[PDB]
Design a protein around this motif. Structure first.
Motif, mmCIF file in Angstrom:
data_model
loop_
_atom_site.group_PDB
_atom_site.id
_atom_site.type_symbol
_atom_site.label_atom_id
_atom_site.label_comp_id
_atom_site.label_asym_id
_atom_site.label_seq_id
_atom_site.Cartn_x
_atom_site.Cartn_y
_atom_site.Cartn_z
ATOM 1 N N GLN A 121 0.816 -1.172 0.000
ATOM 2 C CA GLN A 121 0.000 0.000 0.000
ATOM 3 C C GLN A 121 0.868 1.247 0.000
ATOM 4 O OE1 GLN A 121 -2.934 -0.108 3.093
ATOM 5 N NE2 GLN A 121 -3.703 1.922 2.689
ATOM 6 N N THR A 147 -5.326 5.924 0.661
ATOM 7 C CA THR A 147 -6.287 5.466 1.607
ATOM 8 C C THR A 147 -6.631 4.063 1.172
ATOM 9 O OG1 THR A 147 -7.941 6.409 0.155
ATOM 10 C CG2 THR A 147 -7.244 7.725 2.187
ATOM 11 N N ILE A 148 -7.296 3.374 2.056
ATOM 12 C CA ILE A 148 -7.625 2.025 1.801
ATOM 13 C C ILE A 148 -8.586 1.967 0.606
ATOM 14 C CG2 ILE A 148 -9.606 1.869 3.461
ATOM 15 C CD1 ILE A 148 -9.084 -0.855 3.319
ATOM 16 N N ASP A 149 -9.503 2.921 0.452
ATOM 17 C CA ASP A 149 -10.337 3.034 -0.799
ATOM 18 C C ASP A 149 -9.565 2.839 -2.132
ATOM 19 O OD1 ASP A 149 -11.256 5.101 1.452
ATOM 20 O OD2 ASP A 149 -13.026 4.422 0.309
ATOM 21 N N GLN A 189 -8.853 14.880 -1.654
ATOM 22 C CA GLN A 189 -8.161 14.811 -0.367
ATOM 23 C C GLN A 189 -8.848 13.846 0.532
ATOM 24 O OE1 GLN A 189 -7.699 19.394 0.014
ATOM 25 N NE2 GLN A 189 -5.859 18.327 0.711
ATOM 26 N N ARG A 190 -10.059 13.430 0.179
ATOM 27 C CA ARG A 190 -10.587 12.336 0.914
ATOM 28 C C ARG A 190 -9.847 11.040 0.579
ATOM 29 N NH1 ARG A 190 -16.362 9.518 1.928
ATOM 30 N NH2 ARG A 190 -17.232 11.399 0.928
ATOM 31 N N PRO A 223 2.196 4.902 0.804
ATOM 32 C CA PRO A 223 1.872 5.804 1.947
ATOM 33 C C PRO A 223 0.746 6.802 1.709
ATOM 34 C CG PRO A 223 4.235 5.928 1.409
ATOM 35 C CD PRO A 223 3.633 4.675 0.697
ATOM 36 N N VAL A 279 -3.665 11.186 0.648
ATOM 37 C CA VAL A 279 -3.252 12.059 1.696
ATOM 38 C C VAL A 279 -1.819 12.427 1.460
ATOM 39 C CG1 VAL A 279 -3.033 12.386 4.255
ATOM 40 C CG2 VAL A 279 -4.887 10.930 3.312
ATOM 41 N N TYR A 303 -6.280 1.825 -2.445
ATOM 42 C CA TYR A 303 -5.540 0.595 -2.465
ATOM 43 C C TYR A 303 -6.453 -0.595 -2.807
ATOM 44 C CZ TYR A 303 -2.043 -2.913 -1.013
ATOM 45 O OH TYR A 303 -1.175 -3.937 -0.903
ATOM 46 N N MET A 304 -7.655 -0.586 -2.295
ATOM 47 C CA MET A 304 -8.495 -1.724 -2.457
ATOM 48 C C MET A 304 -8.723 -1.909 -3.956
ATOM 49 S SD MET A 304 -10.101 -4.052 -0.628
ATOM 50 C CE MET A 304 -9.554 -3.019 0.687
#
Ligand SMILES: COc1cc2ncnc(Nc3ccc(F)c(Cl)c3)c2cc1OCCCN1CCOCC1
Ligand SMILES: COc1cc2ncnc(Nc3ccc(F)c(Cl)c3)c2cc1OCCCN1CCOCC1
Lengths: 299, 299
Positions: free
Chosen positions: A231, A236-238, A272-273, A233, A276, A240-241
């Protein structure tokens, strides 16, 4: 299926001036001054019976594609040494561009590039074309808000009710390849999806090498052991998923390009949601009257 | 609102040994021996493009939650068949556990489980997550004093200023559902409160079926006729009154989870005042050195 009625344009050598060298079997930046058309078009010009064969198969594919997110071939020149004339992409390839400008790339651009690349790839899929070499090195930057897919060297137009391409034996980029492709040399739009995932990963890490220091022979076993790229840095997990979905062993379980457009658009609308990045809101990226960009030159 | 920066961990298949089967699309008890970390972690391992999609949406949600009273996902394995690796809960689900151990459950444990479950649910509410499937079958037992909420299969992270979730059409558990949810398929934290009430009722009756022998289609009309589940024999009116408040038709009139923590704590501090259970004061419930519970394994 349908007849391919693309036009292939043959250019006169005297219609174009090479300006400076960009690379070295030798690409020039130059200008194309067609006919007596009162336009000048910025272009890139690429200048052994195997070699000539290859290059014309490429011109064949680029001639058959027409999309705002795929490279634009203007024509060929049949001079002793064959020349390909393409749209000049002043900012070069997107890998070097994220490498050279990391301190200045915001989340908005990263997400826009993902949407644009998925659009180009969805368009190739519609044309039943499997690219087989999608990577950030094969994405050109017309402007920082406008990228196009390039390098049609391994690409294959699928004929008939051919659902896959079974490749013969050449040097092929292992770190961007679907596991079916590595193991059985099968290529689908679904294996392009896998390379899309790696390409997004290269963008999200600002140009870092996938599986750096691992030799290509191991890659098969790692992948079946269930391991994947880590992943980044900023992600977000969104986000990456989505990469990981692109890397499912079951090819039909991977997202479709058309779905990747939707997902990355949703995210691009609130960047930005989903990424990051430190300092994001603060980041921005002679005889010449008759200059016209290739995109505005339609014939 | 905020970026979801949970990490999703991808595990190598060789890092874990399946030990015995627990259920059958097939869950194993097993051990996870990461990296070269000199730890062994007891785990449960769960092993069609719809199916894979679902399971990764779940991994997505479990990855985004971190609380002593919510299940712990350790990672996923992208083997041909996708594997979810979670903390092993040796005593299984709380429904079977109250069924199998009724003659041994005192009021102290019943009330502690209610407090722990309300804490987990309050934490989900803070994360703006609506669970939609709270039931005693979806509560796991790490030890008889420590339970965690599980089964994130229907769960929904609320985006934006979304105040409710409007569901599409699937098979959904009617006997645990708020009446707004049944009638209009609307889900809020307030409808989780209703399922909390039913879950407490299943605990208070030692695992009995809500509305046993009534078919799900009638449930709507019964509820609007004003009927509710009956007062369990062990329950004082204090505890029943709380269930019934959870079942008010006016959703905002139902207690909040944070208030349920307070009420059940007050009661847990003098258990025999609030549950009257016969025999209460009399009831109590290989290579292995490197064994460490997931809760102690923080990375
Ligand atoms: C301004 O930069 C380019 C624009 C380009 N615009 C359009 N096409 C390019 N390449 C290209 C590639 C294949 C072709 F057949 C033709 Cl005709 C052109 C271009 C290659 C370009 O640069 C080549 C890469 C520059 N390097 C190469 C050596 O050092 C690292 C940076
Ligand atoms: C020792 O018992 C369990 C511990 C568990 N610990 C953690 N997770 C479990 N389930 C679970 C559920 C979903 C998952 F994705 C994963 Cl990875 C695991 C577990 C399921 C467990 O048991 C399954 C239920 C046993 N049964 C099923 C058949 O007969 C009635 C009793």
């Amino acid at each position: 299926e349908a007849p391919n009625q693309a036009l292939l344009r043959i250019l006169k050598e005297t219609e174009f001036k090479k300006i400076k060298v960009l690379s070295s079997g030798t690409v020039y930046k130059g200008l194309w001054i067609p006919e007596g058309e009162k336009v000048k078009i910025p272009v890139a010009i690429k200048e052994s019976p195997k070699a000539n064969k290859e290059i014309l198969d490429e011109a064949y594919v680029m001639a058959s594609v027409d999309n705002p997110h795929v490279c634009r071939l203007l024509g060929i020149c049949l001079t002793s040494t064959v020349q390909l004339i393409m749209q000049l992409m002043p900012f070069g390839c997107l890998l070097d561009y994220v490498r050279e400008h990391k301190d200045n790339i915001g989340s908005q651009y990263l997400l826009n590039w993902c949407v644009q690349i998925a659009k180009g790839m969805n368009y190739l899929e519609d044309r039943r074309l499997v690219h087989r070499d999608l990577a950030a090195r094969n994405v050109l930057v017309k402007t920082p808000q406008h990228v196009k897919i390039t390098d049609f060297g391994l690409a294959k137009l699928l004929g008939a009710e051919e659902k896959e391409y079974h490749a013969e034996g050449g040097k092929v980029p292992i770190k961007w390849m679907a596991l079916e492709s590595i193991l059985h040399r099968i290529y689908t739009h679904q294996s392009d999806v896998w390379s899309y995932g790696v390409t997004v990963w290269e963008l999200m890490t600002f140009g870092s090498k996938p599986y750096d220091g691992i030799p290509a022979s191991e890659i098969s076993s790692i992948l079946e052991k269930g391991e994947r790229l880590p992943q980044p840095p900023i992600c977000t997990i969104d986000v990456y998923m989505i990469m990981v979905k692109c890397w499912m062993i079951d090819a039909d379980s991977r997202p479709k390009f058309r779905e990747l457009i939707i997902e990355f658009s949703k995210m691009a609308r609130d960047p930005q949601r989903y990424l990051v990045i430190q300092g994001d809101e603060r980041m921005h990226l002679e005889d010449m009257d008759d200059v016209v960009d290739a995109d505005e030159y339609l014939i």
